[PDB]
């Protein structure tokens with residue numbers, strides 16, 4: 001079982017914005033999660049070949065990862081904050097769908113998600 005193409009991070013005809021909320025999602029949210037000791041499994045698309053997870057992309061039909069999110073934020077791919085928040089939530093949910101409760105990777109996702117929730121709680125009002 002092979003890897004799919006990664007999610008796109010560039011699409012010139014998709015309209016985009018740089019908003020204060022999106023800036024916060026990069027400068028505070030992504031940066032906080034990216035530097036965490038448990039970030040590493042989430043910094044790039046899951047390589048199902050190297051990890052010997054041939055069923056991964058049979059089960060996970062909407063892959064997402066922080067490498068992709070980082071590129072989307074840096075390349076101003078998004079129209080609004082909700083699109084980016086959805087990407088983080090997709091990433092966490094994929095982990096919980098694929099893995100078993102208590103697995104290391106689930107504990108890692110939970111630690112990142114707790115921080116994510118704390119930061120999104122203080123998402124600034126749109127300017």
Ligand SMILES: O=C1NC(=O)C(c2cccc(Cl)c2)=C1Nc1ccc(O)c(Cl)c1
Nearest residue numbers: 040041042046047051095098099104105
């Ligand atoms: O990119 C990766 N390199 C690794 O060794 C892993 C990985 C695989 C199994 C357990 C743990 Cl804690 C990490 C990655 N990421 C990953 C990210 C989410 C997942 O659900 C799974 Cl199974 C793996």
